[model samples]
Target chain A: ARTFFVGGNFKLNGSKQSIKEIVERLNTASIPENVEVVICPPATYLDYSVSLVKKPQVTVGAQNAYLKASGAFTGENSVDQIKDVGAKYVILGHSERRSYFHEDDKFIADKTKFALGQGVGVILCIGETLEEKKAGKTLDVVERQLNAVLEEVKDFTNVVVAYEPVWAIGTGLAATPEDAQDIHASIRKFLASKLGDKAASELRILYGGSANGSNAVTFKDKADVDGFLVGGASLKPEFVDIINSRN
Target chain B: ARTFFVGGNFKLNGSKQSIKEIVERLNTASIPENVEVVICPPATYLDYSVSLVKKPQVTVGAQNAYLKASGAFTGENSVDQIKDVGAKYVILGHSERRSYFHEDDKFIADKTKFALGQGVGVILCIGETLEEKKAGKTLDVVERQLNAVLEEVKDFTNVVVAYEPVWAIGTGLAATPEDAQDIHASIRKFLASKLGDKAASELRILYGGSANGSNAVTFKDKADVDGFLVGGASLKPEFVDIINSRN
Candidate 1:
């Protein structure tokens, strides 16, 4: 069975002092043995957050990184540098990067391959925008996104796919548990078509975009909904509740 | 007269250990009282570098920052956060970001205004490409770049303009002092036209592009060349020589 994974993307938020509070709260929380949590802070806070986390169940990650280890790509964090700071994972292909920074699927794929190559885990994000959803092309858009990475990467051992619908992100609207389960199942079927059943079955697919403590337990019975990639609520005390939802 | 400024842009380089060594070296170097030294390290190391510097003359800066104070711009560090980590300056409109990340003049100007608004200094980089220089449109390119900022920013007190020609950057081709002086003079004259003579005269215009310790003394006699924005050589011991060049 896949271990339930919950990732908290602090997402361009948090002061060092506030993040310390968040980390301290998680350090003493009663997390279930079946759940693994990763807190992704802003690039500047990665090292600071990494140093503060005392629990083995909770680790820190970068919000994003470039493909190169180190070079003249000023203002960018390389995957190797992310690892150098003791971060266990790096979040790649975030929707904000795709929309705001012009990160195309192929470019994100290159970053995914490079991060995985350096033995750093990847929380690979894939989602369709509202326009694509209205056009009834959500599956096609997400498949194309996944296909780009699948072309460059054959190993899924260290990758966690976060399905965050663009329309739901930061809008205070989350997909219903049924809708999330359906999409998660479809994503798994897509993975199975490429990597076959056994490999696909072990992969953890997360539901992100407005996930919170109040509604997390609703998805507890979902077979393919392995866990969540919590957004804004991740910064609050409620994050611990989401982490222990499996209980 | 304005304080002589020498900025070392580590660009997308340095590990924690290497940066610690670089910071320790500067902490003990005898920098001229008239010279202000700012080291631009990768975002991950900004807090770390800030903690290691013991000299009042030396300070830390971020290679880049987003205009927002906080919220939802994943993979970006805000000016407030940069300041919170003790970074005194933020480099905006770097050619690397302009070319690689598609940051246009207006966007960079917005970031400039925001950084200064938050009481953080801005290393506003403006440069012409090889083709533009070859066509004798160097002044036109840089003026357009500066005009965007000048429209929004009436105060030039916290802004340090870095004039780095794209062709000369990382290409081992430092512009001759005569060539650098001509451009610097032109840039100042252009600023005078908009900002008036006194404010324009007080503004520090820095020369970047293949600046190294070996060639630091060549520009001593150039009136308009206030100091340098060192690139590759900033990581080496010669950075101390560049810092003390005026001595």
Candidate 2:
């Protein structure tokens, strides 16, 4: 009973012309009524992309945002500023942020709770590293990441969980449909245990990591795989195909 | 003769309306020919501020930026993206990033070289913490911070150094003019020791950390005191006076 969610994370990419072109494509594409699409461009293009969209099915989000609305925190984008520019969502806790920027689980959890408090949606990412995957500790690692947010946020009303395995992200090695479903199902089960069965059942869980148009259809059979949080392929025309894969 | 420089770091603050108002104030102000002004807003509003400015004396910049043009570094803005949106400069290595985001000296140095290589001006920040200052290691700390970039970047062109004491930033406790001038002079001497006298003399070194309109004129008589990087007051009308302080 959950609406399918397809988010495009254009991480550290896009220029004015390229973003305008991407938005133009989405503005004219045939987006399904059952799918909710969030195009996350670089912070520079959040307002520009917001102005270029013509479809209700397509909306703009930020790649990341700070917990505070405004302050002396230099180099940070705040949820208030994101919403001020008409961006409706923010992609938080991505592996890139956790790895390169040293954002701990507690910090990500705080940011998630803060963003949701400000009436903005969050595409919260959680996963394990290559070594963790090799050691058969994927579930343990993801559970630890999820538990941090679970302790802070009781209601996942405005949160969309994106399970982006660090080893698979941008490596051109996507998790098989079976593997993705297994982890996604485990994630849902964990959520149900923490936040009642009804709420967990209604929450959407997306499988991110090398999710392109051609392979997006393969996950259609997985009950727990609601949609995708696409990376590189989100910048291309095939993104339209991925958006319509569930059609 | 070196041109006087004033940068307004809006930091993590500003809505679209606030930014527009700030830009409008700058657009209509009677700016002096000898002064070069750059308004550094949060990355979200860089393009909007750039589009709003109508003055040759005024330009827009990003509060922070990554070295890369584009890639998989999520939640980070890039120099190429900053320049693509008409931002001509970027603030790097601020105390906020150092304290909160854990950006080390070497990483910041690399980013400085990268942003400069990409043809974007760098407003590089350097200073000491409260404990460092109390221990009389202020110069040592600042020199160490500057040396990292000096080792990587030979030329001082397109680089504006802002000396912001960590304890003073947003604490309403600015370093006294005498102390600020002493640090500025010593910093210039250090730069000359490495980058030659001509380049060091021509370069603009700004004093940040709680600088406001009321006291900006106090540093006017100091020979080496160039200008300021205003924080909170940049959001108000008094920023116009700070821009025209030298006049």
Candidate 3:
């Protein structure tokens, strides 16, 4: 069985005081030993978070890692430095990055391939927009996004696929556990087609959107719903409850 | 007269050892007391570089910052967090971001206004592309770029404008003192038209793009060229010479 993975994306949020408290809570909280959890703070706090997170179960991640290891790409964070700072995981191709920074799939795929190759594990986020879902193009969109990665990454051993529907992200509207499972199952079937049954069966596909403590437990019985790539709720003390929701 | 300023943009470069060496060199170097120096390291090294820099004359800056204080803008750093981590200065609107990331004049100006508003100083970069320069639209390009900032920022007190020609950047083809002087004079004159003469005259227009210690002093007599925004040489020991160029 695949490990239940959970990732908290702080996004462009958090101050020093708040981050300190969040890290402190996680450090002291009675988190489950079996669950794999990664805290993705903004690039500004990646180094600090790495130092603050005391739990071996909870590691730090960067919201973004540039494709290149290091050069003239001012304002873009480096994969090597992110790794050097002791952050083992990096989040790539989140919808916020795609919409705000104009990160096309090819661009994100390039970054994913480069980051994974650099020995940094990646929480690779893929999702469909509200419009795409309404039009029933959900599977098509996921496949297109997946096709970009399939072209670049030959070995997906260290990658976690996070399916975050753009509409549900911070909108207080999350995809139903049933709805999410259908898509997750479809994604696995597509992966099996290209990567074969063993790789597909073992791959962890996370549901991200407005995931939180109250609603996280609802996905427990969903077979294909491996875990979560949590958003706004990641900053609070309740994140521990969400991390333990599967139990 | 304004204090001479020199900023080192490490760009997408440096490691734990390399950044340590660079910070140590500046810390040990006997530089001018009057000149202000800022080193713009990659975002990954900002916190460490801030801690390592010992010279009061030499400070730290971020290579980039986003317009918002904090939010869902992944792959972007926040000015609040940038300042929270002890980075007092942020570089905005470099040609690389413009070309690679498609940052228009208005968006960069928005970030500059927001960053300055958040109490972080701005090393605002502006220049024409090779095509625009060849077409002799240097003043027009700089004016439009400056015009964008003038629209957003009512106060220009904390902004340092760096004029870097695209062709000269990283080409080892430095701009002629005369050519740089002309653009600097034009930028100041344009500023005078909008913000009045006192503010424009007091403003520091820094020369960038292939600026180094050897050619640093050649602009000594130029009334408008205040200092430099050093690139590649800032990582080396010669940065001190460039900082002391006026002496």
Candidate 4:
């Protein structure tokens, strides 16, 4: 009963010419209406990107935002500004953010609540580092991260969960389709344990990391792996294929 | 002789409506041409602000930027991206970034180098905290921050210095005019220690932190206080007064 969600994280890459091409690809491509597609261009292109997106099937998002709707934080963007620019969604707490920017789970959780409070949907990202996975702490780490947001905003609306393994990101390797399914199931079971039952049935856990257009179709039958939070390929023509791959 | 430099830091604030008013105020106002004026708006408004600026008298800037040109650094804005959207300058290492975002001097220096490498001008912000001031380490603290960037970048042709005391940022209280003058001169002395007297003498030092239109004129005639980096006042009508106050 859930809509398949595909979010493109443009991250810290792209130029005016390249972005124009990517937007042109989406504008003309025949995307499936069943799949909900969100493209998060860099902040510089957000206002410009919003103006270019004419298709109702494709919307724009911000890669990150500050907790406050507005404030004195230098080098930071706010939920109010993000929403003001016409982006209805924001991708928060990505592993890249947690590792490089010294963003803690508590900080991400606070930002998540603040964004939600501002009426912007969040594709809340969670995952384990290589060491955590090696030590058999993948589930523990995922639970810790999720619980932070769940605790902050229980039964949130428009909050999609993306489970990305740190080692798989930007690397050619990814979790096998079966492995991702099992992990998603385990996450749901844990959620049921914490939220008492309703949480497991409703929450959407997207598989990220090395998930390109070709591999995207393989996860179609994985009931718990709702969709994807695409990285590199999101900026390419293949993003259209990924959106239509549900068939 | 040092040219007067004034920048308005509209930090994490302003709506599209308010920005329109700010830009309108700037577009029609009769401003002097002897001094340079830069407006640092949030990343979300950088493009919008840049488009609104019709005159060469005013230019647009980014409140903050990432160290890298591009990659998987999520939620971060790249210097390339900033430049692509018509931003001629970027504000780095503000007190808000240091205390709240945990941006250290070395990291800020790295970002400064990356931005400078990409050909974007840097308004490098440096200052001291109240506790450091009480301990009489104000000069020492300012030197450490200035040195971090100064040491990283030796021949910075497009750099403007902003001194914003952390305690006075939002508070109505400001350092006495005499106090700001002494600190600014000492800051130049430290610069002379590294870059030599001629280079130090030519560099401009701008006083921030609780600086407004009413008090902006008070810093006039102070040898090293070449300008003011107005925060709150930049969004209002008096920003023009602050811009014209150099006389």
Instruction: Highest DockQ: give the candidate number.
Output: 2
User: TM per model?
Assistant: 0.99, 0.98, 0.98, 0.97
Off by over 4 Å in 3: none
The pairs that clash in candidate 4 are A75-B64
Weakest 10 consecutive residues, lDDT, candidate 2 chain B?
Answer: B217-226
What overall lDDT, based on C-alpha atoms, would model 4 receive against the true structure? 0.87
Could you give the CAPRI-style class of model 3? high
Q: Is candidate 2 or candidate 4 better by lDDT?
A: 2
What are the iRMS values of all candidates?
0.8, 0.7, 1.1, 1.0
lDDT, residue B40, candidate 1: 94
- Model 4 DockQ vs. reference: 0.83
User: Candidate 2's residue-wise lDDT over A61-93, tens digit each?
Assistant: 999998899898999999999999999999999
Clashes of each: 0, 0, 1, 1
Better of 1 and 4 by lDDT: 1
* Candidate 3 residue B42 C-alpha distance from true site, Å: 1.6
- For model 1, fnat equals 0.81
Native-referenced TM-scores of chain A, all candidate models: 0.98, 0.99, 0.98, 0.96
Candidate 2 lDDT tens digits, B42-96: 9888888999999999999998888788999889989999988899999999999
Q: How far in Å is the alpha carbon of A32 misplaced in model 3?
A: 1.6
Model 1, B25-144: lDDT tens per residue?
998888887789999999999999999999989988999988888888878988888888999999999999999899999999899999999999999999999999999999999999
Candidate 4 Cα outliers beyond 4 Å, as residue runs: A193-199
